[PDB]
Structure formats: C-alpha cells, structure tokens
C-alpha cells in the first residue's frame, strides 16, 4: 500500500544487510557507495597513491538489485563549498567519483545533502555530472524541514536560542533548496528528499513544500512517540502531515537506530502501513482522476474539431451535469406553462450542439416530470455525431425531423424557439466560444425566450508549482517559437501545486445578449493578496454557470459540484517565474481578443514586478471560429 | 600463532594507546573491500605489531572502529559505525577480549569517545550531532545533549574535573562543558576545529587543531603556529614534566612541538594518513604512531 526504504550509514556486509532490511518489509535501502570515513587524496603525494580498491565490487549484487533496491549516499566528508581550498578540490573529485560509480551501477537515485546556505559549487559540480555521458540516476536533495541550528537544545549559556518569531528565519531551508534548483535551471533529475524533525514549523511552510518535487519523506526513529503497549507512534500534528504526503504519493524513509527496543524495528513501518490503511478512500472524481495527476493536455475545440465517439461517450457518463440540466429545464417549463394551459400550449425547445443527444434525453425527462408538452429540435454540426442521432431518430422517432445537421450560426429555424439548451462550456467557460456560437443562434430565440445556460463566469487564482513549470518547459517543440509553450492554456488535474490566493472572477457572459453592439472582447485587472513568500509559475482557471435560477454547475474548488468530471482546471503559464514576498499583491491582467476568424486570450503580470505580455495577437494560441 | 583472534587484521589502523605497563592497544577498520568491519588487538610486545601471529589477544567487532580508549587496565571503550558504544574487557589471563556491552544509542556513526577522570563515566560524540554521557558501570546514557548544529568532530574529558569536557564540531563551535550548570556548554572565540588536547598540568589550558593544519593554544582564564599543510587529525601531549606536543595530520606527517609550539621533530615515515600517537610509560623519548598505510612506527624523539 506504501513504498518505503531504510537509511543506514553502516553496512559491514552488503549481502546480509540488504537481506535483513528485506526481512523487515522494506522495498529499498539508502546506503553509502564508498565507506563514509574512507577519505581520499586526489592531488598531494603520498596519500594520492593509496593502493588497492577504492570501494567494494559491483559483483556483490545482480544488476537488477543495483537498479531497484539501492539508493546511493554521497560520503559526508565531501564538502565542495569548504572555505579551505584543498578540501574544496578533493571534494570536487570525490563527488564526481561517487556519482560516476552511481551511474556505473545504474542506481535508481542518489542522496545529496542541503545542510548549509551556500551550495553553489555543489550545484555546479552536479550540473557538470548531469551534462557528462548518458545516465538517468535521480538526484534526491536531503533538505531539513528545520535547520539543525534552529532545533538545537538551548544549552549554550553564552549563545541562547532566539525566543522571538522570525518569519524568514524559520522558512530558511526552502530558500536553500530554491537557490540550488534555480542554479541547476530546474533540472527534472533534481528532486527533494524532505527530512522531518521532532518540531514542525507553521502550516504556511508546510503549504510551501507541496508544489515542490518531493520524491521522498525522511522520518528519524527519534521523532516517534510511544503508546500504551510500548510501540512506536506519531503525534496528531505529524500524522496530518503524513496524510498530506501520502496524497502526493511520495516514498518514506526510516532513518536512525531502534529507539523502541522491546517492540522490534519492523514496527515503525507497520505504523506507516497502519496510517495508510486508515485514511478516507478516494471519491468518484478522485477515482476517475487517478492517472491524470499533473498531466498537461490541450483544451478541446469542439467548434473547429469534431469530437471522437469515445470522447462523447466519457462526457455522457458524467452523473451530476445532465441531472442538473434536466432539473433546470423542469423548473423553466413550470415557470413558462400555467397549469390551465397544460395541454393547449406546447413549448418550442432547441438543443444547440446536441452531440449524441444527452441534452435531448434530459429535455424528454424534464417534459415528463413537469407534465408539460414540448416540440424538440436537435442541431449538430459534427456529421459523425449526426449519424448517431439520425439512426436513433429513424429507429425510435419518425415524429417529423429535427436532428437537423447544421451550424447553429448557419441554421435557418422553421419557427422561433421558447428555450435554447447548450453544453458549449469549457474549463474557462467562454473558451469553447459559447458566447460567439449562441450570439449567432440568438435571432431564432423568441423575444421573451430563455437560454440554458443563462449566464456563466470564469475565475483565476495564482499558483506556485515547480513541477508544473517543468511539465510546460518540456512541451518545447521544434519548428515553432522556443517559448510558445508558455503562451497557451493547458487543461490539467493540478496535483503538485500551491494556490497563493483565493479565486476571483474574470469574464462573465449573459444569454440572451439583449443590448446592441454585443462586443464579446474583454480586458480585466485582478489583484491577489499573498500570505507567504513564494514563486509564481502561473494561474489556475475554473468556472461556474447559472443553468436556470438556483440551478448551477461549478468547478471552483470551494463550490465544486460533487463528482462532476466533465471539466478539469485550466492553466495559464508565465515564461519566467516571478518571486513573491509575504504581504505583496500579485496583479494579473487578462484580455479576451477576437477577429472574424479566431478568438484568443492575452495576459500579463504587473505586480509585484512586470511580465512580458503573453500570446500577443494569438501568435502561440488561438480558438478557431 | 593467534589465540581466539582473527587470521588477518584490517588495513586501516585507527588508534594506538599504551597502558601503565608498556603494552600496546590497536584499533583497526577496513574502509574498502567486500567486508566493512573492525578489529581490536593487544601487543604485550609493541615491536611485533602489527603481526597477527605475535599478538597477545585480538577480536573482531561487527563494524568499523572510528575511535577507542583504555578504561583503566582491563577495559576498552569503542565507537562503532553501527552507532553503538561498545565496552570489551580482557579475561583474567589477558589472552581473550570479550564484549561486556554494545548499546546502539546514536542515530549515526559514533566518531569520538573520551573517558572522564572518575573512570566510572565516559562521553561520546557522533555524526548525528548528539553528545551523550555514559555510566560504564550501569551501561546506560545519563544525559544526551544536542548543543551542536553539525557533526561532532571530537570530544575530550577534563583530565581532573569529572564534569568538564571540551567538544568541537563542523558547526565551528568549540564548547567548554560543566554538567553542574543548567546550561552546561560555553562557546570559546575562521577555519573549522578538528582535534582537541587538554594540557595535563593546567586544569585551565588546552590545544586545538583546525582543518587547515594550524595548531592553536588557549586557557579559558590566542598563541598559534601553522604546523601542517593539511588538517590536524590528532594532538597527544607526552608524559614529561615540561611535556612535548605530538601533532598528526592527513598530510601523512608527524610533528613534536615545545610549549611555545616550536617544531622539534618531523616524520614522513608515513605514506598514508597518520591517525594516532601514544608515548610509552617505560620510555618518554619513545613515540609510537599508526596510519592507514598499516605501519606501526616507533620514533625516538630527541629532547
Ligand atoms: N456552432 C456550432 N453549431 C453547432 N454545433 C456546435 C457548434 C459548436 C459546437 N457544437 C457542437 O456542440 C457539441 C459540444 O458538446 C460538448 C459536450 C461535452 C463537453 C464537455 C466538456 C466541454 N465541452 C463539451 C462540449 C458537439 O456536438 C459539437 O458538434
């Protein structure tokens, strides 16, 4: 249920030691590749000519083992940022030597410590290694939640621990990591092995780290409490954090010696296993989303692309959406039809972008439950989908036509309509061009007609995520602008991210658009209060819509419709990450632009510092009309 | 010709310590090869060491010897990589060596260990940044101190007061300690400290060596001279009335100095790191050193 290995700094017999660990229930072993006290001279004789083998033979395990069961640890004496030159040099050599052995063996990962503030020459040695030969060992930076300095015992008489609350001075180990990964231009091979101490920081720090590439959590034996029966356990505060990490699907590393002696050493693991067993099992949405975690995709364009049969099939499996649509139509019918007109007056209902007919079925269902009479039209421009409709029409209908294949902007209605129903909404509401499509169709709506949906509104929120930043980076393609990938929205189930301020509304559209001119372009300025220091990597997009009166759908996280998987968050990246300091405001500006042929978004950051305007003139991203 | 001892002693010689009667103690780890462990040896004849065949007793430790010391005359206090402190004692005949205890208490390699003047207590320092005090009689830790913010490089008990000791660390702090204060530690004002020696005739004075090969002199109630090209690993004062200062470094050299730190001896006899020194009780011009080149050397020091 949970993947977890064992940290050791002492391995007399690699054969037997790996076996003991396996007996305990562990899945891998973080160990040293050279003896951690075996210190080596690369330059001054005589020590440089130390004879014999520098470490134990690679023959000591299967390549399989090396590839799967072992994690390398950089010897603790290696200090590439030493103030002493000779050390700095022997360190440069030693490090490359150890990392090169780690590559030779095909180690899955290798541990390096961030345990002081200046790791500049260490970053740089590792950057050369990464660009030397061909190898894909992962690099796990051991960084503490709290500096060893900031949880020393207050027992130096003449050097006391600060009893003040320092906001930056207890955030300091994140700047260490930030500075290191920044120097390595965010290499996707460099991740975080986050070490947990007995004291935790404030929850702001804990929010910070999620959104950083944590591949490993490290729990010292020393932080474990004991229960009635004398067994290892953790505080409610430490557990809540473990639960938070399990959600990120990290790996767990038990380090240090056996402090609960009478109770064995495989017991710590069992507590982790126990915790994993006892958390709420995933909901429908969460079960459905498993796999799609932080997976960037292009947002669908049903206006200028014909959707696949199986694309339609999955959207039809959405429980809540069509239930909401049905209900919305039912209320509308009641409001429009008095009881004494039950059979004299029959409503003219038009589904626009009717697809394979899920909104048609909703209308039928509504008609019955409201006990009112309707005359149904189905308008569909996707001919591949029209085949589905006409087969069903032919097999189960024969009542006139109206499965009429046409573009709703093109179509000439035989009569004006009471109600027009559409499911043209995107993850950013107006980004499938619902506005432009319905403005075309508006003329055949009755002077007192109702559109479902009646109105929708898009929402943005600034986000910090070094994982998503890299994901976008890796969308760089040949034969196009090298920074094109930063100038387009992605649909994505955001997972490893941090939301820096609450969502606020961007653009709103009402239907029908009663007034003249009816310009569909917009420019809108938004300001976000930022509670921590952070790094801005882009903006989440969500939406809500009013189908009819109190009937709504919403992907806004706070008001999210329960178990509705038809839409996922959208993402607006920014080319260059913008550092934010606690208390600052983040000011973003968004434009909706259009011409005859295409509609697009431009956006910019104006505070605290300015960004370049993104996607000017839809040069990287457009939506086809 | 070894009795219950091992066939071959590990190549990396770590410690060398004469006792009252002029017998030599040897700690060894193997820091490269299939098998990463450690061994202990008594040489009733110093001159035969390190000959496995010509030893008095020897034994295998589960893992590596980072440091040891004597505990009176029958006792050996050891710092395993395992994170354990081990107490071994010689049998009545002085021909076996037997694990009295081996408690796994540090969360990492135990790197240093000094016996307090009482003899009934010792203090060890580790890479887990924790200093602990042991009662050897009861085989338990009385107190554990996280004074430091980095690896504990070296700890040295007061020769006289049995509640005082020095400690130094990668975090660049030298600490003077008194167990009798509610806050038992005191910082004492560049390059990191690496070795600690108390002066034997002043409760008040001690020498430290830095990672840069400078030896320094201090009484809490600074004089220095750069002795070495690489880090000072070790500092042991001779037994003489006005006593000499043996210093040893990763530069594979041994110096002996006078009270003003003026150099009176030199030996690149060693061809790998020099890891210990210990002066004889039966002779005070006999200095013995051991290093990772496997050489027990017996220097004659002019005075
Ligand atoms: N101008 C137009 N004239 C006629 N028909 C039009 C049109 C524009 C689009 N259509 C049709 O509308 C349907 C879109 O349906 C969904 C279904 C599920 C979705 C889930 C998430 C997001 N968006 C979704 C959109 C398609 O059948 C397409 O042909």
Per-domain boundaries in chain A: 1-287, 288-454, 455-625
Residues in A closer than 8 angstroms to B32, CB to CB, are: 34-35, 38, 52-56
Q: Inter-chain contact B105–A257, Cβ cutoff 8 Å?
A: yes
Residues B129, A536: Cα–Cα separation, whole Å: 37
Q: Which residues of chain A does B127 touch, with a Cβ-Cβ cutoff of 8 Å?
A: 9, 36, 76
Q: Cβ contacts of residue A64 below 8 Å, gap of 6+?
A: none
Q: Which two tokens stand for residue B210?
A: 């830095």
Bridge partners for A236 per DSSP: none
Contact B294, B39 (CB under 8 A): no
Radius of gyration of chain A (CA): 30
d(C-alpha A178, C-alpha A569), whole Å? 26
Task: Tell me if residue B110 falls in helix, strand or coil.
Answer: strand
- Residue A587 CB neighbours (<10 A): 16
Q: Are A434 and A424 in contact (CB under 8 A)?
A: yes
Q: Does residue A156 sit at the B interface (CB-CB below 8 Å)?
A: yes
The one-character DSSP state at A37 is T
Q: Does A407 show up as a binding residue in the annotation?
A: yes
Separation between Cα atoms, residue B61 and residue A231, nearest integer Å: 30
Q: Provide the H-helix boundaries in A248-382.
A: 267-277, 284-289, 309-316, 319-336, 358-370
Q: Which of residues 97-126 of B touch A (CB under 8 A)?
A: 104-109
A107, A31 Cβ separation under 8 angstroms: no
Q: Compute φ and ψ for B194, nearest 5 degrees.
A: -130, -30
- Beta strand pairing status for A138-144 and A109-113? parallel
**Which listed CATH number (3.40.50.10320, 3.40.50.150, 3.40.50.1000, 1.10.1060.10) goes with A288-454?**
3.40.50.150
The phi, psi pair for A515, rounded to 5°, reads -70, 160
How do strand B174-178 and strand B152-157 relate by DSSP bridges? Answer: unpaired
Known binder of ligand: residue A229? no
In angstroms, rounded to a whole number, what is the distance separating the alpha carbons of residues B220 and B205? 7
CA of A548 to the centre of ligand 1 (A): 19
Quote the tokens at residue B245.
């200062």
Please tell me the residue having the least CA distance from ligand 1 atom 11: A353
Specify the pairing of strand B110-115 against strand B97-104.
unpaired
Query: Cα distance from B159 to chain A (closest Cα, Å)?
Result: 22
Q: How far apart are CA B91 and CA B98, in angstroms?
A: 7
Question: CB-based contacts of B196: which residues, under 8 Å, 6+ apart?
Answer: B154, B155, B156, B166, B167, B168, B174, B206, B207, B208, B235
Q: Where are the domains of chain B?
A: 3-303
Contacts of B160 (CB under 8 A, 6+ apart): B117, B203
- Residue B174: which of B158, B196, B159 has the closest Cα? B196
Residues in a beta bridge with B288: B278, B298
Q: Is the dihedral of CA A136, A142, A143, A149 positive or negative?
A: negative
Q: How far is CA B68 from CA A472, A492, B6, B40, in A?
A: 56, 59, 19, 10
Do residue A35 and residue B64 have CB atoms under 8 angstroms apart? Answer: yes
Q: Which own/partner contact pairs does A126-134 have at CB distance under 8 Å and 24+ positions apart?
A: A126/A95, A126/A99, A126/A184, A126/A190, A127/A183, A127/A184, A127/A187, A128/A96, A129/A95, A129/A96, A129/A99, A129/A100, A130/A184, A130/A187, A130/A189, A133/A103
Contact map slice: A 479-518 vs B, CB within 8 A: none
Looking from the CA of B268 toward its CB, the CA atoms found within 13 Å total 6
> Edge to edge, what strands does the sheet with A598-607 contain?
A522-529, A585-594, A598-607, A623-624
Residues 2-21 of B with CB under 8 A from A: 11-12
Sign of CA dihedral A353, A358, A361, A366: negative
Task: Say how far residue B93 (Cα) sits from the centre of its chain.
Answer: 26
- How, if at all, do strands B164-169 and B254-257 pair? unpaired
SS3 B229: coil
Q: Are B178 and B163 in contact (CB under 8 A)?
A: yes
CA distance B32 to B95: 29
Q: Do B63 and A83 touch (CB under 8 A)?
A: no
Burial pattern A437-453, b for ≥16 Cβ within 10 A else e, equals: bbbbbbebbeeebbbbb
Q: What is the 3-state secondary structure (H, E, C) of A220-242?
A: EHHHCEECCCCCEECCHHHHHHH
Neighbours of B282 (CB within 10 A): 11
- What does the alpha-carbon distance between residue B159 and residue B116 come to, in Å, rounded to a whole number? 7
Catalytic residue among A92, A432, A471, A602: A432
Yes or no: say if A194 and A214 are a contact pair by the CB < 8 Å rule. yes
CA distance A104 to chain B (A): 18
Closest partner CB to B81 (pick from A9, A57, A155)? A9
Atom number of ligand 1 nearest to Cα A426: 22
Contact: A147, B175; criterion CB under 8 Å: no
Q: Which residues partner with A540 through β-bridges?
A: A461, A571
- Surface-to-core class of residue A133, CB atoms within 10 Å of its CB (0-12 exposed, 13-18 middle, 19+ buried): exposed
Give, as one character, the DSSP assignment of residue A493. B
Whether residue A474 contacts residue A492, with contact meaning beta carbons closer than 8 Å, is answered with no
Active site annotation includes A13: no
A432 belongs to the catalytic site: yes
Shortest CA distance from B14: residue in chain A: A37
Smallest Cβ–Cβ distance between B211 and the set A35, A87, A257 belongs to A87
Tell me how far the alpha carbon of residue B59 is from its chain's centroid: 19
DSSP B115-148: E-TTSSEEEEEETTS-EEEEETTTTEEEEEE---
CATH of domain B3-303: 2.130.10.10
Name the residue with tokens 């697809």.
A355
Residues A158-178, buried b or exposed e (16+ Cβ, 10 A)?
A: eeeeeeeeeeeebbebbebbb
Burial of residue B190, with CB atoms counted within 10 A of its CB: 0-12 exposed, 13-18 middle, 19 or more buried: exposed
Give the containing element (helix H, strand E) for A586. Answer: strand A585-594
Q: Do A44 and B104 touch (CB under 8 A)?
A: no
**Whole-number Å distance between alpha carbons of A147 and A156:** 17
Mutational pocket test of ligand 1: of A299, A300, A301, A302, the residue with most ligand atoms within 8 Å of the beta carbon: A302
Ligand 1 site, CB within 6 A: A 300, 302-303, 307, 315, 353, 355, 379-382, 385, 407-409, 423-424, 426, 432, 437, 566-567
- How far the first Cα of chain B sits from its last, in Å, is 38
A29/A73 Cα distance (integer angstroms): 10
- What is the enclosing helix (H) or strand (E) of A92? helix A85-105
Short-list B45, B55, B66, CA closest to B2: B55
Helix or strand run (H / E) with residue A88: helix A85-105
Token pair, residue B68, equals: 């040891």
- Cα dihedral: B99, B105, B107, B112 (round 10): -70
Bridge partner list, B236: B246
Are the CB atoms for A436 and A422 separated by under 8 Å?
A: no
Which of A92, A98, A212, A423 is the catalytic position? A423
The answer to whether the beta carbons of residues A182 and A120 sit under 8 Å apart is no
Q: Quote the minimal CA–CA distance from B106 to chain A in Å.
A: 7
- How is residue B269 written in tokens? 């006899």
B73–chain A Cβ distance below 8 A for any pair: no
Resolution value in angstroms: 2.8
**Closest Cα of chain B to A48: distance in Å?**
9
Is A481 flagged in the annotation as binding? no
* CA–centroid distance for B116 within its chain: 13
Name the superfamily (CATH) of residues A1-287. Answer: Divalent-metal-dependent TIM barrel enzymes (3.20.20.150)
Is B181 within 8 Å of A159 when comparing Cβ atoms? no
Element counts in chain B: helices (H) and strands (E): 0, 27
3-class DSSP assignment, residue B246:
strand
The H-or-E segment that residue A202 falls in is none
Euclidean distance between CA atoms A134 and A477, whole angstroms: 22
Judging contacts by C-beta atoms under 8 Å, the chain A residues touching residue B146 are 151-153, 155
CATH of range A455-625; options 3.40.630.30, 3.90.230.10, 3.10.400.10, 2.70.160.11: 2.70.160.11
* A140 φ, ψ (degrees, to nearest 5): -105, 110
Q: What are phi and psi of B295, to 5 degrees?
A: -95, 105
* Cα Rg of chain B (Å, integer): 18
Q: At A188, phi and psi to the nearest 5?
A: -80, 0
Residue A485: burial class (beta carbons within 10 Å; 0-12, 13-18, 19+): buried
Instruction: Measure CB to CB from residue A47 to each of B12, B33, B273 and give the nearest one.
Output: B273
CA distances from B186 to A37, A155, B175, B182, B297 (A): 29, 9, 5, 12, 38
Whole-number Å distance between alpha carbons of A199 and A10:
27
State whether residue B237 is helix, strand or coil: strand
Interchain pair A84, B37: CB under 8 A: no
Ligand 1 center from residue B287 Cα (angstroms):
92
CA pair distance A591, A603, nearest whole angstrom: 6
SS3 B180: coil
Euclidean distance between CA atoms B144 and B134, whole angstroms:
9
The first and second tokens of residue A581, run together, are: 């300091």
A415 annotated to bind ligand: no
Cα separation, B129 vs B126, in Å, equals 6
Q: Which residue has the tokens 């986000």?
A: A463
Size of interface A-B (CB pairs under 8 A): 141
Q: With contact defined as beta carbons under 8 Å apart, do A389 and A380 qualify?
A: yes
Helix-helix angle A319-336:A358-370, to 10 degrees: 40
- What is the spatial distance between Cα B182 and Cα B167, in angstroms, rounded to a whole number? 18
Pick the closest to residue B98 from B58, B54, B49 (CA basis).
B58
**What count of other Cβ atoms lies within 10 Å of the Cβ of residue B179?**
17
Task: From A411, A407, A330, A322, select the one nearest A369 (Cα to Cα).
Answer: A330
**What sign results for the dihedral spanned by CA atoms A421, A425, A430, A431?**
negative
- Residue A297 CB burial class (10 angstroms; 0-12, 13-18, ≥19): exposed
Nearest to B37 by CA among B4, B71, B70, B66: B66
Residue A95, classed as helix, strand or coil, is helix
A542 is in an annotated binding site: no
Angle of the A172-183 helix axis to the A120-130 helix axis, nearest 10: 40
Contacts of A113 (CB under 8 A, 6+ apart): A74, A76, A141, A142, A143
Q: What three-state secondary structure class fits A55?
A: coil
The 3-state secondary structure of A360-400 reads HHHHHHHHHHHCCEEEEEEEECCHHHHHHHHHHHHHHCCCC
Q: Name the β-bridge partners of A4.
A: A252
Rounded to the nearest 5 degrees, what angle is found at the Cα of A580, between the Cα atoms of A574 and A584?
A: 120
Residue A282 C-alpha from the chain's centroid = 17
**Residue B303 and residue B289: Cα distance in Å, rounded?**
18
Contacts of A139 (CB under 8 A, 6+ apart): A109, A110, A112, A126, A130, A187, A189, A190, A191
Report yes or no: B78 and B86 within 8 Å, Cβ to Cβ: yes
Q: Tell me how far the alpha carbon of residue A303 lies from the centroid of ligand 1, in angstroms.
A: 6
Residue indicated by tokens 């950083």: A212
């Amino acid at each position: 249920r949970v993947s977890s290995g064992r940290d050791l700094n002492c391995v007399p017999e690699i054969a037997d030691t790996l076996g003991a660990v396996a007996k305990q229930g562990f899945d891998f072993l973080c160990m040293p590749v050279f003896h951690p006290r075996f210190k080596r001279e690369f330059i001054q004789e005589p020590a440089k000519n130390r004879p014999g083998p520098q470490t134990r033979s690679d023959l000591l395990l299967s390549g399989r083992d090396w590839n799967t069961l072992i994690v390398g640890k950089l010897s603790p004496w290696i200090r590439p940022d030493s103030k002493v030159e000779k050390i700095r040099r022997n360190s440069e050599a030693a490090m490359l030597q150890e990392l090169n052995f780690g590559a030779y063996l095909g180690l899955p990962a290798f541990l390096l410590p961030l345990n002081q503030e200046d790791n500049t020459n260490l970053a740089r040695v590792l950057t050369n290694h990464i660009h030397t030969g061909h190898h894909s060992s992962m690099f796990w930076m051991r960084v503490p939640l709290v500096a060893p300095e900031d949880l020393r015992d207050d027992i130096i008489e003449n050097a006391p621990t600060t009893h003040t609350e320092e906001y930056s001075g207890e955030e300091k180990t994140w700047m260490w990591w930030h500075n290191f990964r920044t120097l390595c231009d965010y290499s996707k091979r460099i991740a975080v092995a986050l070490e947990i101490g007995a004291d935790l920081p404030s929850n702001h720090v804990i929010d910070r780290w999620l959104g950083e590439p944590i591949k490993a959590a490290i729990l010292p034996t020393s932080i474990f409490l004991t229960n009635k029966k004398g067994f290892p356990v953790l505080s409610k505060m430490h557990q809540r954090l473990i639960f938070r990490l399990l959600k990120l699907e990290v790996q767990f590393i038990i380090t240090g010696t056996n402090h609960h002696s009478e109770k064995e050493f495989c017991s710590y693991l069992q507590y982790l296993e126990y915790l994993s067993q006892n958390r709420p099992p995933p909901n429908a949405y969460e079960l459905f989303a498993k796999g799609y975690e932080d997976y960037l995709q292009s947002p669908l364009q049903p206006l200028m692309d014909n959707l696949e049969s199986q694309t339609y099939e999955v959207f039809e499996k959405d429980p809540i959406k069509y239930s909401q649509y049905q209900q919305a139509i039912y209320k509308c019918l009641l409001d429009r039809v008095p009881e004494e007109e039950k059979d004299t007056n029959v409503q003219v209902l038009m589904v626009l972008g009717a697809g394979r007919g899920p909104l048609v079925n909703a209308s039928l269902r509504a008609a019955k439950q409201a006990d009112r009479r309707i005359k149904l039209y189905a308008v569909e421009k996707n001919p591949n989908a029209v085949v589905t409709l006409e087969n069903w029409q032919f097999e189960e209908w024969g009542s006139q036509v109206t499965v009429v294949s046409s573009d709703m902007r093109e179509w000439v209605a035989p009569e004006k309509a009471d109600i027009i129903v559409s499911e043209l909404l995107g993850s950013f509401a107006d980004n499938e061009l619902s506005p432009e499509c319905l403005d075309g169709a508006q003329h055949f709506l009755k002077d007192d007609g109702v559109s479902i949906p009646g109105e929708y509104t898009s929402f943005l929120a600034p986000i910090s995520s070094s994982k998503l930043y890299n994901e976008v980076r890796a969308c760089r393609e040949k034969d196009r602008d090298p920074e094109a990938q930063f100038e387009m929205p992605y649909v994505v189930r955001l997972h490893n991210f941090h939301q820096l301020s609450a969502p606020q509304p961007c653009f709103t559209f009402s239907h029908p658009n009663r007034d003249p001119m009816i310009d569909n372009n917009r420019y809108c300025t938004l300001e976000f209060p930022v509670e921590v220091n952070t790094v801005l990597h882009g903006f989440a997009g969500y939406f809500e819509t009013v189908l009819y009166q109190d009937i709504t759908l919403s992907i806004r996280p706070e008001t999210h419709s329960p178990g509705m998987f038809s839409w996922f968050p959208i993402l607006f990246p920014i080319k260059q990450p913008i550092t934010v300091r606690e208390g600052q405001t983040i000011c973003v500006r968004f434009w909706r632009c259009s011409n005859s042929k295409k509609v697009w978004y431009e956006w910019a950051v104006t505070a605290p510092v300015c960004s370049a305007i993104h996607n000017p003139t839809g040069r990287s991203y457009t939506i086809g009309l | 010709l070894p009795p219950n001892a091992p066939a071959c002693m590990e190549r990396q010689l770590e410690a060398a310590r004469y006792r009252s009667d002029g017998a030599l103690l040897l700690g060894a780890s193997s820091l490269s090869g299939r098998c990463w462990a450690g061994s202990l040896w008594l040489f009733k004849d110093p001159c035969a060491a390190p000959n496995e065949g010509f030893c008095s007793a020897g034994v295998q430790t589960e893992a590596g010897v980072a440091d040891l010391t004597w505990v009176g005359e029958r006792g050996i206090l050891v710092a395993s990589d395992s994170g354990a402190v081990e107490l071994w004692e010689l049998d009545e005949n002085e021909t076996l060596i037997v694990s009295k205890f081996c408690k796994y208490e540090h969360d990492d390699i135990v790197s240093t260990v000094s016996v307090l003047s009482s003899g009934t207590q010792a203090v060890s320092g580790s890479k887990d940044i924790c200093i602990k005090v042991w009662d050897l009689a009861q085989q338990v830790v009385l107190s554990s101190y996280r004074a430091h913010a980095a690896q504990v490089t070296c700890v040295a008990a007061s020769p006289h007061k049995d509640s005082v000791f020095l400690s130094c660390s990668e975090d660049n702090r030298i600490l003077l300690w008194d167990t009798r204060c509610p806050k038992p530690a005191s910082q004492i004002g560049g390059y990191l400290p690496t070795s600690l020696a108390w002066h034997p005739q002043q409760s008040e004075v001690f020498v430290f060596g830095d990672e840069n090969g400078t030896v320094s002199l201090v009484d809490t109630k600074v004089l220095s001279s750069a002795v070495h090209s690489q880090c000072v690993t070790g500092l042991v004062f001779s037994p003489h009335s006005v006593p000499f200062l043996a210093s040893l470094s990763e530069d594979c050299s041994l110096a002996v100095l006078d009270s003003s730190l003026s150099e009176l001896f030199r030996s690149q006899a060693h061809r790998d790191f020099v890891r210990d020194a210990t002066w004889s009780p039966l002779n005070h011009s006999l200095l013995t050193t051991v290093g990772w080149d496997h050489q027990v050397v017996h220097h004659v020091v002019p005075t």
